[PDB]
C-alpha cells in the first residue's frame, strides 16, 4: 500500500 497507509 505504501504512502497512503502511512499518512492517508
Amino acid at each position: 500500500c505504501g504512502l497512503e497507509c502511512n499518512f492517508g
Partner: antibody, heavy 119, light 113 residues
Framework: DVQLQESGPDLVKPSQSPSLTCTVT?????????WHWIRQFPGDKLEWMGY???????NYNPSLKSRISITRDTSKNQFFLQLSSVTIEDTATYYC????????????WGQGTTLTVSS | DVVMTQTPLTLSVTIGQPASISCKSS???????????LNWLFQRPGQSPKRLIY???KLDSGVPDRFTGSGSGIDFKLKISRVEAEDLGVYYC?????????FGGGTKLEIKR
C-alpha cells in the same frame, strides 16, 4: 507555532492496559494532517506505531495491528494511544507527531513521555 | 519492512570540518507518484527528535544551509559543510514511501579529540 505535549503514567505493571495522551495546541487535529505515535527503545531504536487521520480514520504497524489502538477527542483537541496486555519490552519513550502525506514525513515532534514497565 | 542501513555507526569530527552520513535502503524509495520520501531526523541525548530534511533534499524551517541532502533509488546522503557544536547528537534516516514507516539505526556524531 504548533506544539505537542505527551502525558500519562510513568510506571506501569506488566499485563496491564495503560493509555497515553497527546495534547496539541496551535492547530486543529480535525483540519488537515495525520497524527502519529512513535516509540524509542533503549539503544535509541525508533518504531512507528500508527496514526489517526484528520477524517478520523486509523492505521497501525502490521507488527502491532491487534495489540494497540488509537482514538481521539475532538472537543478536547487530543488523541490517545491504548496499550494492551503490556510487557517489560514495551519500556520506551513514547512520542506523538504530526504527519504530512505531501512531504511523506513527520514535521512536528513532542517532548515524549517515558513509560517504564516493571513489577 | 524496508531496512535502513546507516554508515557509519559513530562519526568523529573536528569542529569546523566536513562530515557525511550515508543511508542505504533494502528497497527503492521512489514512489509511483514520482517522489522519493526520505527524511533526516536529528536528536540530542535527553532531547526529543526534530526533522532536519524531508523529500531527500528539502531543508526544514530553522535548518542552516551548511546541511545538504542527496541521493535517489536506494542510496542517500546527508552532508554537513562544517560541523558546529549545535550539530552534535544522533542522526536518523527515515522513510515514508513503504508501509510501514521505518527508521535507520542512527549515526552518533561526536567531537574528535
Amino acid at each position: 507555532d504548533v506544539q505537542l505535549q505527551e502525558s500519562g503514567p510513568d510506571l506501569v505493571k506488566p499485563s496491564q492496559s495503560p493509555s497515553l495522551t497527546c495534547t496539541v495546541t496551535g492547530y486543529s487535529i480535525t483540519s488537515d494532517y495525520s497524527w502519529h505515535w512513535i516509540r524509542q527503545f533503549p539503544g535509541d531504536k525508533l518504531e512507528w506505531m500508527g496514526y489517526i487521520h484528520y477524517s478520523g480514520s486509523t492505521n497501525y504497524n502490521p507488527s502491532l495491528k491487534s495489540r494497540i489502538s488509537i482514538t481521539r477527542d475532538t472537543s478536547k483537541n487530543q488523541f490517545f494511544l491504548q496499550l494492551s496486555s503490556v510487557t517489560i519490552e514495551d519500556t520506551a519513550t513514547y512520542y506523538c507527531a504530526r504527519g504530512t502525506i505531501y512531504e511523506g514525513s513527520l514535521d512536528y515532534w513532542g517532548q515524549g513521555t517515558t513509560l517504564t514497565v516493571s513489577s | 519492512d524496508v531496512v535502513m542501513t546507516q554508515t557509519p555507526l559513530t562519526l568523529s569530527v573536528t569542529i569546523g570540518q566536513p562530515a557525511s552520513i550515508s543511508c542505504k535502503s533494502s528497497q527503492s524509495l521512489l514512489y509511483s507518484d514520482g517522489k522519493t520520501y526520505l527524511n533526516w531526523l536529528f536528536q540530542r541525548p535527553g532531547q526529543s527528535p526534530k526533522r532536519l530534511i524531508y523529500l531527500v533534499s528539502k531543508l526544514d524551517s530553522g535548518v542552516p544551509d551548511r546541511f545538504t541532502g542527496s541521493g535517489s533509488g536506494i542510496d542517500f546522503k546527508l552532508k554537513i559543510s562544517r560541523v558546529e557544536a549545535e550539530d552534535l547528537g544522533v542522526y536518523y534516516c527515515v522513510q515514508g514511501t513503504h508501509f510501514p514507516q521505518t527508521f535507520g539505526g542512527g549515526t552518533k556524531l561526536e567531537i574528535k579529540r
